[PDB]
Amino acid sequence: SFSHFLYYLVLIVVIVYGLYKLFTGHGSDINFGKFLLRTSPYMWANLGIALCVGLSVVGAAWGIFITGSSMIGAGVRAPRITTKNLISIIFCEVVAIYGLIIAIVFSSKLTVATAENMYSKSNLYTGYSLFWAGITVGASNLICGIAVGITGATAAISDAADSALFVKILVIEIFGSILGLLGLIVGLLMAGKASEFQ
Amino acid sequence: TGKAWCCTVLSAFGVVILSVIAHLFNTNHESFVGSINDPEDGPAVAHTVYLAALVYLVFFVFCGFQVYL
Amino acid sequence: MTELCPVYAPFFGAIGCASAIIFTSLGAAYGTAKSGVGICATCVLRPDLLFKNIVPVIMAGIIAIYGLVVSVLVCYSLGQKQALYTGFIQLGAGLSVGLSGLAAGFAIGIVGDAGVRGSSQQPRLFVGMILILIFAEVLGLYGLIVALLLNSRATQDVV
Amino acid sequence: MTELCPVYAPFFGAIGCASAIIFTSLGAAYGTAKSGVGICATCVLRPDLLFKNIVPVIMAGIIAIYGLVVSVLVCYSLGQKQALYTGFIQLGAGLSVGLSGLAAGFAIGIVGDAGVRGSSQQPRLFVGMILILIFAEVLGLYGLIVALLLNSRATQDVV
Amino acid sequence: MTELCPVYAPFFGAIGCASAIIFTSLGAAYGTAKSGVGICATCVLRPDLLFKNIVPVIMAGIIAIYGLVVSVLVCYSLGQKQALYTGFIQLGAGLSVGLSGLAAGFAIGIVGDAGVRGSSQQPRLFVGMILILIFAEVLGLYGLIVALLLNSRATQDVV
Amino acid sequence: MTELCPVYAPFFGAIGCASAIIFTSLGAAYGTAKSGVGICATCVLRPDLLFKNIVPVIMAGIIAIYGLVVSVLVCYSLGQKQALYTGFIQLGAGLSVGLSGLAAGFAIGIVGDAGVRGSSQQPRLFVGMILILIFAEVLGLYGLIVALLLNSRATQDVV
Amino acid sequence: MTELCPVYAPFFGAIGCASAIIFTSLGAAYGTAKSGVGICATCVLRPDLLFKNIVPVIMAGIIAIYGLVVSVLVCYSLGQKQALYTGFIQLGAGLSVGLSGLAAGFAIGIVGDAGVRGSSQQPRLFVGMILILIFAEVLGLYGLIVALLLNSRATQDVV
Amino acid sequence: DDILSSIWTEGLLMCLIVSALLLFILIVALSWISNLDITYGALEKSTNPIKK
Amino acid sequence: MEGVYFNIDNGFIEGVVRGYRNGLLSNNQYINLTQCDTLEDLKLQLSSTDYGNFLSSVSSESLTTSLIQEYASSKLYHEFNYIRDQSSGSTRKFMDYITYGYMIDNVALMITGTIHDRDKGEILQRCHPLGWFDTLPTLSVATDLESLYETVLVDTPLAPYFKNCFDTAEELDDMNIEIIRNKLYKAYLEDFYNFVTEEIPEPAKECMQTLLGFEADRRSINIALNSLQSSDIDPDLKSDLLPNIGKLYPLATFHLAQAQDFEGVRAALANVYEYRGFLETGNLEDHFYQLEMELCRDAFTQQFAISTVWAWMKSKEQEVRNITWIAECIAQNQRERINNYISVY
Amino acid sequence: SNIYAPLYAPFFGFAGCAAAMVLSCLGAAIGTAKSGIGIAGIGTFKPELIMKSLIPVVMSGILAIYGLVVAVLIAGNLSPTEDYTLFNGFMHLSCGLCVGFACLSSGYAIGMVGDVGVRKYMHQPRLFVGIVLILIFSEVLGLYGMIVALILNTRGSE
Amino acid sequence: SICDCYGIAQYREINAGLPTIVTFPFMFAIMFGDMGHGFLMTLAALSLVLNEKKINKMKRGEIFDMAFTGRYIILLMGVFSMYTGFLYNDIFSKTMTIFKSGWKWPDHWKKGESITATSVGTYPIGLDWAWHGTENALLFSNSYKMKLSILMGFIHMTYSYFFSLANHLYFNSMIDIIGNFIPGLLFMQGIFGYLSVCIVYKWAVDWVKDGKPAPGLLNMLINMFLSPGTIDDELYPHQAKVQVFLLLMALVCIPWLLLVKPLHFKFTEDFGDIMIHQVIHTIEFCLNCVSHTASYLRLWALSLAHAQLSSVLWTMTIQIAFGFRGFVGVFMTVALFAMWFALTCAVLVLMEGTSAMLHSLRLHWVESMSKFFVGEGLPYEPFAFEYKDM
């Protein structure tokens, strides 16, 4: 298709452009180093603070219409379940609160730094750590928000057939929520050492 | 009927909002002529707002007889 | 002209202003249309449930007002000679609420359409629609929280 | 000629002036086309409701006028010698109304195509259709607000 | 050549003069084709209505001229030596009419394809159809006006 | 380092040694796979033809042997200091057999699945399939015949 | 620092270490997945052929062990100070066994699915399926041989 | 000459990879809206003299 | 994967269907019907289950076995047009192809009325409601096919299916209709199979590719049997009545057209274990209905698929076929074959 | 000062601590999700065979532990005062990609097996042993990824 | 009629309908917050009420019945909206200049020259009118209205939370006082009660005169969890001594909320039912002490929005006309006014009314009533007669 035809073409320009600069003796000009040393360390940090709360909140709201849209379905013949199956809406939301906490922890570290001590060792580490801490915590919770919603619609059904099936399934949905807690940990160990900008 | 209440209540408060506005440009109130973007001459404006406020008093009395009947 | 005030920094401010009111306006349209099909179908048979099923339209029409707010705080913080620091802070403000208010605009649309189709068949099911519709609308706000704490650090000891 | 006023600045003024009306015209064109099918399917049987279901077509024409206003105000701020700051402010001032009127266009077409038909089997539904459009039309009004606050700040405090 | 007058400025004048007529004819064909089907399959049983169902084909035939009267005004301002401001502005006047007149072609075909088929069954709909198309032809006019205000400012106060 | 013998020359040798066995081994999978399914259907009813029908699986395997004898000879011609003429040709030897042997695998898999199903209903047809599966195999042989002339020429009159 | 041995050479040796694992797990898990369905579907009627139709899951797992041998074997050849030649070769080692074992997945997974459904019916088929599962496995074995000869040259006559 | 380049400055890339991210998300969202399709059956009037 | 993009539009449909199934009658709920004395105790019994107060508008004398079957299927169609009116897009087409099969029944039921010269009002009550279209009763006009084709059936979506049907005589009769009716399921079950192959996502695809492999085997065999009642039919004619999707395709289809006795048929089916011993024993049609539950019983095991809707109907028609079968046994005081009812749930 | 220790080296030391968890957590979810679909799929038929068939989800749950162990070791070898080589930055990258695409593959097989293996366990209870035996061969692929990711990290330091 | 829609109250518990008389329309005032618009809501409620005997007999639509059914709800929302806007000092986006301003400007300056003020005293009642038109206004209201809504959320919740105590003392269930009530009291009061009290202390301390820097409160709340015993800027003596104890207090109240009530049953199958329901009472309640307190910050934004729609709608419509003169000037003032009065009476009173009308409902059903409300009641629908609409 068209949108799949571009992906074959972007690969081809990068390969022509990767050789023309090489067979002529200019390969060092494509230097990702200077792209990391000269770019402002504030850009890498203000993305990890917006994607953490950005990609996490997409996770929660994703798992809610997979969950709610089926609870409302079963509750046309068995409307008693709306208050017992509410739990699966809580485990979809809590990952958002995991993200909203990190963004406030990292916002404490955003300070003003001089023009001479900007591109120093302690300020490049900070930006690069606050970035891959926002991707990890925003991608883990993005997926935990989907594996809980899916698992939350099966229990919303089985509860409607016979109530004995509900509690036996939360052992799956509780092992689905661990994953959002493990990125919250690892995201901090990165930024446990990083010191605010000087 | 409803077609007159609209221009009645609108013209009613329109007289009461515009009359107070005119009194403030005249007296050169800070919030209205204190800044530079605001108009410089006060009473050159209040003379324009009395006239426009009368226009609403026309429709208040005119459609005031119509609802009466 | 100066290493701390380049001339390409206010780009990140304006783009942050637009990115907050655009994405929420898309999220508040899908959330308004996907419901508007439901109301206008269930109320072919049950027109007494009309002014009780307008609720999903309100919760989605409020997401845009969380964006208009952020489009106005940064607008008064803009200037020609502003630092690169202040730039990306106006970015992460617009990219968060624009991105959190986008998904919550979608969830409100789907759940809103199903609920109105349910209450026609089980009128006890209208309150369950609300509480399931609460936890999605709040997600349009958690990004608004972070937009502010960043923008408070805009002009703190800047030069 | 000047660092604060380069020669590639007006590029972001004409791209912004054009995007104000392009994307609102697409959002208005979706509203007249989509809603225009439902009108022409009901009214062949009940043309009593022919000059009564034109309202969705009106609220699309409102959207394009939110863009024509903005293309004009920027066109009288353009200059060969202007700050690059002024160029960026004109950019987000075009998108914010553009890609928010493009969203209100979808919200009107999806509903108008539905509510006019439901109104043919239930005349009590015509009321509720109006409110569902108004909370969508106002989404485009929020873009018009932001641009004017940006376009006011384009020429003051510049060099 | 000169800082304010490079050699790659007339490049944008060609694209501004070419894109104008192109993106209108893509609208004046899609709007002339979808109508050509609905007419030649509607006038098989009621051929008395031929000369009055041509109206969409006329309006779609107007959109191409809005794209021509812009290319002529532009074409009589091109030169080997002109400012970038003379070139970037001519690009804005090629997109505004081009991509707006394109939308008006998207609408008139989708409308005329259906409004004609109703007109065969109900003559009371013909006056209702054309009211819709006027809201579709005007979107091709708000793109025209912007292409005039830009071209007027394209040479005055220029070096 | 040197003009004719720089440091980035062996990077083409490794890719040529690896490409030859990769693309062939992919071709042999598409052969054994489709032909295996054919064998695992007719031999449900006629196990007598089991050992006759393992010819496609064997011709598929041969293609991977051609991908070996290229990689073997190419390993023992490398060095930290060689010329680009020696490095570019190994890319020419690795792609010929690789993508020719791939094609020879795409034919055998499509023919064997049909010919085994036809040989269950007609025993004479067995010799016809084999006659076809020679030509498909020879396309994988021509690639080898070119690679050898290359690899015997890569260090022929080189600095 | 030296031209032969820059500091960015181990970027190649590391990617040659994971690429052996990455492209085998995709080939051994895929083969274990599609054979893990045929075994379960057939053994309902015949759960006595359970511990004997787990030959495909084994032959797929052997692929990963090839990916594990090489990675451990190159990981002892890595160094802070090494040549590009020592890095380019280790890349060819990983891809070769990597993408060849991936071929085994798209054959063993295809054949384990079918031959096991037929073996439930005709027990004479169990000797036919296996030979096909050997030629599919030999392809993974040729990729190993190429990497073991490459890796003997990585630290052979290198500065 | 310790700079990256003359055309492709560090300030041009920061102003483009941000635009891609802000434009990629816009391409996604419009797909979510394009796939809308109205529920036409519940609006039209249907009648059968078989069942009714 | 499976349930990630499903609930966007097709989620509220999944919960309602799976609510309607828990109202299905288990084996225990059938037994209570078996010992009922009359049709009045029957009404007392079924009110306990999901059928509820479905005869409140009925008297004690009016109870018959036909009034029951009519008021048990009327509850199925308001539960289908509901799910059909709430749908959108691909799920609409899937819920429209199912109607194309129930209208073809109404085609061969109106045309036979023209052969026999019966009143349409007496007929249309016998017509199936899901297979309705507006130009249906106009089929009572004429006898020819080209007459009924161009006048009526070109507008309907049955246009592409009569490509192999314009060999009819100027006089049309009953034995020719059954040859017309059976050439449509040959094409219908293919255009509905290429559809599922393309636009339906997984895992409904693997499920529905099986249920169509069954509905074609049920018909590919029963054509060979009914041809034995007749004197002779050419083998080349039979291959234009057999669908081309099933397990019997292509190998076993060759020997069903060319089987002139009951014994040559079992030689053709002996080479597939799915259809091995059905002919060897017992009532044939009860063996198919047993395998029909077992393929629908495995669809409900899945989740996030739109193959449940097909299974919901076919699992609930056998339900109604068991109410009436038992309803006649109780009313007529023959309590011998009252326990032949089929049940899995 | 030093050429073997540039300042842009930690950029590659976090992409191993990131690509490890995100890919592993993607493998821990697919297995639990599809298995959770096949278990509740039978819960309306045979409620007895559920608690005996929560074996897949923990085999998926263990995958997050594989990526968690790797990352925690990596964060114990980063600091803004340490001299962090560029060699070590590339090893940490491959530490997180080996375990990543391997714990992701394991998470894909266990989801295609536990889905069918449970839904055909209501029919034959002698089938349990074969189901567990196959999932063992689908977990070791996750093990083989961290066997390497411990040898890589050992060498970057020394 | 509002509290009933969520749930029928248990027999002989607290009716939440008395506090709902005042908290509901007063929260509308915090958001709606303008003397000019609130005045209009009162009159349309001052009309429906007075003529209620005529309106009772005649027939009505359906949009109009809900207005008459809640004619007393709308009265209060218009009254209390006039008391707030006098403190916010807003009337149609303009201000009131009654009392003296405790601020003060220099003695002399020039055009385009920036200036800054000098404090003299305090402005008694409301926001001092010197902030209007200023550059850094929103840096004051934003940092003000946040700290308002936090304190107004800490007070509404705890007041709703002592109704739990006044119910256990009725049914004589003392275990829940020691099992359920007190552990949650010690959890959140030890976190947000510490957050609410420090905010008041920071305001009654002249940090400029003493020479000390004013500490931040976000870093104060964060470091006391992560790096306890540490500070960056001091607030008061022995701060780190209290924080570590408050943190130690919370961690002990989780298991004491988790174990004491089930064990009382076992001590005197079912125990599995009593435990798991008590496990869920913790995982919810601890989060509900957090995600509710953030959810009161919708009081902040909708107040922030109602100004930037009003102060724009004044600047784009009517402030245009004050630059024109002549009869052309008399016309533009008259046409633009009715467009100002129309959008005012349609966009800012109805829509922003309804959007703000529902969030106040939300705060009761979910944030406040969730503290004490059990539900699962039986209605009282006695046997009596009436007339059938037929």
From Swiss-Prot, chain B:
Gene Ontology biological-process annotations: endosomal lumen acidification; Golgi lumen acidification; proton transmembrane transport; vacuolar acidification
A Gene Ontology molecular function term of the record: RNA endonuclease activity
Which residues are listed as membrane-spanning? 5-25, 49-69
Keyword Transmembrane attributed: yes
- The residues exposed to the Cytoplasmic compartment are 26-48
Q: Where in the cell is it found?
A: Endoplasmic reticulum membrane; Vacuole membrane
Task: Alphabetically list the UniProt keywords.
Answer: Endoplasmic reticulum, Membrane, Transmembrane, Transmembrane helix, Vacuole
**GO CC aspect terms:** endoplasmic reticulum membrane; fungal-type vacuole membrane; Golgi membrane; proton-transporting V-type ATPase complex; vacuolar proton-transporting V-type ATPase complex; vacuolar proton-transporting V-type ATPase, V0 domain
Q: Please indicate if the UniProt record lists Manganese as a keyword.
A: no
- Domain of life according to the entry: Eukaryota
Topology relative to the membrane: Multi-pass membrane protein
Its subunit composition reads: V-ATPase is a heteromultimeric enzyme composed of a peripheral catalytic V1 complex (components A to H) attached to an integral membrane V0 proton pore complex (components: a, c, c', c'', d, e, f and VOA1).
The free-text function statement in the UniProt record for this protein reads: Accessory component of the V0 complex of vacuolar(H+)-ATPase (V-ATPase), a multisubunit enzyme composed of a peripheral complex (V1) that hydrolyzes ATP and a membrane integral complex (V0) that translocates protons. V-ATPase is responsible for acidifying and maintaining the pH of intracellular compartments.
Q: What is this protein called?
A: V-type proton ATPase subunit f
Q: Which organism is it from?
A: Saccharomyces cerevisiae (strain ATCC 204508 / S288c) (Baker's yeast)
Q: Specify first residue, last residue and whole-protein length for the fragment.
A: 7 to 75 of 85
Swiss-Prot record, chains C, D, E, F, G:
Parts of the chain on the Vacuolar side: 1-8, 75-90, 151-159
Q: Name one GO biological process term.
A: endocytosis
State the UniProt keywords alphabetically: Hydrogen ion transport, Ion transport, Membrane, Transmembrane, Transmembrane helix, Transport, Vacuole
Other information:
Present with 8450 molecules/cell in log phase SD medium.
* Membrane topology, from the record: Multi-pass membrane protein
**A Pfam family matched in the record:** ATP-synt_C
Q: Which InterPro entries match?
A: ATPase_proteolipid_c-like_dom, ATPase_proteolipid_csu, ATPase_proteolipid_su_C_euk, F/V-ATP_Csub_sf
Gene Ontology molecular functions: proton transmembrane transporter activity; proton-transporting ATPase activity, rotational mechanism
Give the protein family: Belongs to the V-ATPase proteolipid subunit family.
Q: Where is this site: Essential for proton translocation?
A: 137
- Mind telling me which residue stretches traverse the membrane in this protein? 9-31, 54-74, 91-112, 125-150
Instruction: Report the principal subcellular site.
Output: membrane
For this protein's source organism, the top of the classification is:
Eukaryota, Fungi, Dikarya, Ascomycota, Saccharomycotina
Q: What does this protein do?
A: Proton-conducting pore forming subunit of the V0 complex of vacuolar(H+)-ATPase (V-ATPase), a multisubunit enzyme composed of a peripheral complex (V1) that hydrolyzes ATP and a membrane integral complex (V0) that translocates protons. V-ATPase is responsible for acidifying and maintaining the pH of intracellular compartments.
Instruction: Tell me the CDD domains matching this sequence.
Output: ATP-synt_Vo_c_ATP6C_rpt1 (cd18175), ATP-synt_Vo_c_ATP6C_rpt2 (cd18176)
Cytoplasmic side: which ranges? 32-53, 113-124
State where the protein is found.
Vacuole membrane
- Name of the gene this protein is made from: VMA3
Cellular component (GO) terms are: fungal-type vacuole membrane; Golgi membrane; membrane; proton-transporting V-type ATPase complex; vacuolar proton-transporting V-type ATPase complex; vacuolar proton-transporting V-type ATPase, V0 domain
Which SUPFAM superfamilies did the record assign? F1F0 ATP synthase subunit C (SSF81333)
Curated annotation (Swiss-Prot), chain I:
Q: Extract the signal peptide range.
A: none
Q: Does the keyword Acetylation apply?
A: yes
Q: Where in the cell is it found?
A: Vacuole membrane
- Upper lineage ranks? Eukaryota, Fungi, Dikarya, Ascomycota, Saccharomycotina
Remarks, miscellaneous = Present with 1630 molecules/cell in log phase SD medium.
- Reported function: Subunit of the V0 complex of vacuolar(H+)-ATPase (V-ATPase), a multisubunit enzyme composed of a peripheral complex (V1) that hydrolyzes ATP and a membrane integral complex (V0) that translocates protons. V-ATPase is responsible for acidifying and maintaining the pH of intracellular compartments. This subunit is a non-integral membrane component of the membrane pore domain and is required for proper assembly of the V0 sector. Might be involved in the regulated assembly of V1 subunits onto the membrane sector or alternatively may prevent the passage of protons through V0 pores.
- Alphabetical GO biological process terms: endosomal lumen acidification; Golgi lumen acidification; proton transmembrane transport; vacuolar acidification; vacuolar transport
Q: What is this protein called?
A: V-type proton ATPase subunit d
Q: Spell out the family assignment given in the record's similarity comment.
A: Belongs to the V-ATPase V0D/AC39 subunit family.
**GO CC, any one term:** fungal-type vacuole membrane
Swiss-Prot record, chain K:
* Protein's name in the database: V-type proton ATPase subunit a, vacuolar isoform
Write out the topological domains of type Vacuolar.
33-34, 96-143, 203-245, 308-328
Subunit structure as annotated in this protein's UniProt entry: V-ATPase is a heteromultimeric enzyme composed of a peripheral catalytic V1 complex (components A to H) attached to an integral membrane V0 proton pore complex (components: a, c, c', c'', d, e, f and VOA1).
Q: Which residues lie on this side of the membrane: Cytoplasmic?
A: 52-65, 164-181, 368-390
Outcome of substituting residue 352 to A/D/H/Q: Abolishes ATPase activity and proton transport, but does not affect complex assembly
Compartment list: Vacuole membrane
Q: What is the lineage of its organism?
A: Eukaryota, Fungi, Dikarya, Ascomycota, Saccharomycotina
Q: Which residues cross the membrane?
A: 14-32, 35-51, 66-95, 144-163, 182-202, 246-265, 283-307, 329-367
The record's comment on protein family reads: Belongs to the V-ATPase 116 kDa subunit family.
Describe its PTM? Answer: Glycosylated.
Additional facts recorded: Present with 55714 molecules/cell in log phase SD medium.
Effect the entry attributes to changing residue 363 to S:
Reduces assembly of V-ATPase complexes
